[PDB]
Design a protein around this ligand. Structure first.
Ligand SMILES: CC(C)CN1CCc2cc(O)ccc2[C@@]1(C)c1ccc(/C=C/C(=O)O)cc1
Ligand SMILES: CC(C)CN1CCc2cc(O)ccc2[C@@]1(C)c1ccc(/C=C/C(=O)O)cc1
Lengths: 233, 233
């Protein structure tokens, strides 16, 4: 994991990529948006667990630390996947290939249009930077590893140290991709920063979305510790 | 602003630095924690406005964009200042030189100890990285410029472009500082990433803290648009 080259890191991440899922609704019936979106998110989470298990370094950690990292990152990870899928659909969010929604469609649930707008703006930003696939898979792994690493014993100290070393390797990998594409050393550092700074915004979006979900006050919304632990164990 | 050298950027930021304020309580009287903390934050905000006005590039923007950026960033900026002040006080938060508080003192307000713990962990992280003063002032300017830039006309497009160019200059400046301290090119990129990734955590802390403040349901808590506009105008 720490012994991987940049090219091997990129290949491993590209190979771990989850599939694009479809919404479950009968397309022959007239057109619950939140029901459809929740069911989709539920099914995505299962594939997210399998993906996480394939990110180099992640299964080197304890089970309890894997659960903590996923608990902190899951909504950010769904969000960055959505934004990526939506990049070539200006003004629309591609929740699934059969569920491409605009901001006006978001207005049907109190509080949702604000979150829709933020996600659309992030997609616009990705389009302006011309984000590449190989850069995207790196960023998504950085989110997994970083989002919970500040909120966790000798074992904990070793785990945090390992997470930081894996993150360094992903940083090396990003810069290598940018070097391969022909950017100058200045451009490399500038773009690295531009990418990492978007991750703060993805965090913000996730916090706003978690507030929405918690506000539903429902046991069948937001995956519990125990459900994540059961799927990861 | 865009014509500044790295060294001139660092000098301008170091010169803009606000003062360290004191809590207002009679030290001869027996020991309201939230009252003291709110009064301190109120007075800090005034100095924050003056600081912001001295960050290169910031007064090149429209008044409405300056207000938006401050509205998005103010709590992150107070938080990164607190964490910096607290760096050489393991297990304590130096809200002011006469108000140095531990996690047990946070437990006196429902919900506060969790936020205290996060801030202490960030201080610990800064101590482990050995963050320098010159790096800190850069990060604080990046927060000002970046936090609201994804949530904003031809003028808006020009403003966002300018913000991104100033952010590039701050990135150049960081790397120059790291080059001046003798780090290799690898170490430079690795540390740049490590620093920027902590900014996601500061965002998260701020969202958690904003949720606390809004939950108070009080007109004399959280600065309004109009108050920020009045102070900035
Ligand atoms: C308000 C946000 C939490 C809505 N998010 C936006 C990001 C996103 C990305 C997806 O790829 C699929 C769905 C979503 C939704 C629409 C969403 C996320 C989670 C849930 C509920 C999950 C649960 O209750 O366990 C519902 C909608
Ligand atoms: C719950 C958090 C919002 C508490 N924060 C933590 C960061 C911080 C940094 C300071 O340097 C000074 C105070 C604080 C406090 C304790 C804080 C921040 C804002 C307010 C209220 C501001 C307002 O009501 O306008 C109260 C406490």
């Amino acid at each position: 994991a720490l012994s991987l080259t940049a090219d091997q890191m990129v290949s491993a991440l590209l190979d771990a990529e989850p599939p694009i899922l479809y919404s479950e609704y009968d397309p022959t019936r007239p057109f619950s948006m939140m029901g459809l979106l929740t069911n989709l998110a539920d099914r995505e989470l299962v594939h997210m667990i399998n993906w996480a298990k394939r990110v180099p370094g992640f299964v080197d950690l304890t089970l309890h630390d894997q659960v903590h990292l996923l608990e902190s990152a899951w909504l950010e990870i769904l969000m960055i996947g959505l934004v990526w899928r939506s990049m070539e659909h200006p003004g629309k969010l591609l929740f699934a290939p059969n569920l491409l929604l605009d901001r006006n469609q978001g207005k049907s649930v109190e509080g949702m249009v604000e979150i829709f707008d933020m996600l659309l703006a992030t997609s616009s930003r990705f389009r302006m930077m011309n984000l590449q696939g190989e850069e995207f898979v790196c960023l998504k792994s950085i989110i997994l590893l970083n989002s919970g690493v500040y909120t966790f014993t000798l074992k904990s100290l070793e785990e945090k140290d390992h997470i930081h070393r894996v993150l360094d390797k992903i940083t090396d990998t990003l810069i290598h991709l940018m070097a391969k594409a022909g950017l100058t050393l200045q451009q490399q550092h500038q773009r690295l920063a531009q990418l990492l700074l978007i991750l703060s915004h993805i965090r913000h979006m996730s916090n706003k979305g978690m507030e929405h979900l918690y506000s539903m006050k429902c046991k069948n919304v937001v995956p519990s510790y125990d459900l994540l632990l059961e799927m990861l164990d």
